[PDB]
């Protein structure tokens, strides 16, 4: 999809600069605007920047850009927790259609925060259904990295379980994260204790959640 | 405002036609400097497919010229997109957009609509609880393709705390996600907590209340 270059992310602390880099060629950047869009998760592009350096309506002053020779720049002064978005460089190309940078992550630098952790049973209407979900949830931590180490009767799980990873919090800067450990609901009656124990920086020791089916 | 709408997402079989439209509130279609189309595939970046301006001259991406119309509908205020043959390197989320004058910076965007191209059939989720000075709560989206599924607490009144996972493809073919809260544990006595499920694929949508 993409044509243009820039890097996959910048990371700095609020109030901070960041800069992101598009780079073209002579036929598209060299002698065509430039424009940046900030994506949102979720949302469509919005235009930052047109006309390689001129801001619309609605824009604040701690955006700006710069096109110098086949490279553009976006600078991004004042950072807040709300700049957390994927960016785009866009120009025109040899046959003046529009073509894309690939995108840049934006991600905010904050102060490490465990994961406050929960786990929970399957619900009583999924085993009437036949299977069994149990799923552990890592609240609003940081850094990104965490561990997730499932046990059910003491037997440490490997692949049947499946994470995903919420988007940066556009208030605090944090991540959760959600774990789905799964089982036939007969394998499910043949274990008692079920047990979901998290690994983080900001945790001096793993933390265990756990429960025992039925009790 | 001027407002843009795609047409609702789906799946779309490979070799089939993929047709969306985009209504227009807010502005005539025949007055629009272009209208056009760009796709996002999951996890990439955005790609221009086409446009068609005021005169009704189209301009498509070289690479799928061979299979895309663009078209406007003046009596329903709207423009539309056919991409032909598709296969699975189509799935994307798909936007209009639009200039309505020439001397305007900013276009107008839709929401994005996302289309999975897949041999597989639409099927609808099920619904379960995850339930709970703080407490978490939620909501197991289960056994459903394709993406998306939208999820709310208590019909939007409910947002702080909400996290709304990415969904996980099971190795059956199906997705499932979940959406979780962390409220008060005072208010499980008093607060009823309902998350509303909409798979629009499907026309699935379901208010499940999530009880202590
Ligand atoms: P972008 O979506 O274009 C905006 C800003 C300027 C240029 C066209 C219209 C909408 N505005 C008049 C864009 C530009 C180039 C490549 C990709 C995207
Ligand atoms: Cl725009």
């Known amino acids: 999809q993409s044509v243009l270059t820039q890097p996959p992310s910048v990371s700095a602390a609020p109030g901070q600069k960041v800069t992101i880099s598009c780079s073209g060629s002579?036929?598209?950047?060299?002698?065509?605007?430039v424009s940046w869009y900030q994506q949102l998760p979720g949302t469509a592009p919005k235009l930052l920047i047109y006309?390689?350096?001129k801001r619309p309506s609605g824009i604040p002053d701690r955006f700006s850009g710069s096109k110098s020779g086949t490279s553009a720049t976006l600078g991004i002064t004042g950072l807040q927790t709300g700049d957390e978005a994927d960016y785009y460089c866009?120009?025109?190309?040899?046959?003046?259609?529009?073509?894309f940078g690939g995108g840049t992550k934006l991600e905010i630098k904050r102060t490490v925060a465990a994961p406050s952790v929960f786990i929970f049973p399957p619900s009583d209407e999924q085993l009437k259904s036949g299977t069994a979900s149990v799923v552990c949830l890592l609240n609003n931590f940081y850094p990104r990295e965490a561990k997730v180490q499932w046990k059910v009767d003491n037997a440490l799980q490997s692949g049947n379980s499946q994470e995903s990873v919420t988007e940066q919090d556009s208030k605090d800067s944090t991540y959760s994260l959600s774990s789905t450990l799964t089982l036939s609901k007969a394998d499910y009656e043949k274990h008692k204790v079920y047990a979901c124990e998290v690994t983080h920086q900001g945790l001096s020791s793993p933390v265990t959640k756990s429960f025992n089916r039925g009790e | 405002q001027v407002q843009l709408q795609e047409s609702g997402p789906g799946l779309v079989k490979p070799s089939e036609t993929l047709s969306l439209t985009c209504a227009v509130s807010?502005?005539?279609?025949?007055?629009?400097?272009?209208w056009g189309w760009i796709r996002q595939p999951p996890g990439k970046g955005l790609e221009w497919i086409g446009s068609?301006?005021?005169?009704?001259?189209?301009y498509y991406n070289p690479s799928l010229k061979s299979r895309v119309t663009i078209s406007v509908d003046t009596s329903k205020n709207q423009f539309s997109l056919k991409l032909s043959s598709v296969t699975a390197a189509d799935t994307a989320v798909y936007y209009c957009?639009?200039?309505?004058?020439?001397?305007?910076?900013?276009?107008?965007w839709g929401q994005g609509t996302l289309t999975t191209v897949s041999s597989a059939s639409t099927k609808g989720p099920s619904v379960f609880p995850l339930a709970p000075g703080t407490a978490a709560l939620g909501c197991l989206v289960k056994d459903y393709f394709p993406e998306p599924v939208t999820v709310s607490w208590n019909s939007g009144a409910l947002t702080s705390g909400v996290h709304t996972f990415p969904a996980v493809l099971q190795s059956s073919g199906l997705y499932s996600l979940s959406s979780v809260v962390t409220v008060p544990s005072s208010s499980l006595g008093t607060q009823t907590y309902i998350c509303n499920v909409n798979h629009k694929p499907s026309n699935t949508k379901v208010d499940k209340k999530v009880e202590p």
């Open positions: 957009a639009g200039l309505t004058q020439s001397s305007h910076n900013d276009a107008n």
């Open positions: 807010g502005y005539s279609i025949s007055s629009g400097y272009y």
């Open positions: 006309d390689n350096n």
């Open positions: 002579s036929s598209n950047i060299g002698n065509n605007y």
């Open positions: 866009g120009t025109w190309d040899s046959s003046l259609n529009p073509v």
């Open positions: 068609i301006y005021h005169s009704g001259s189209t």
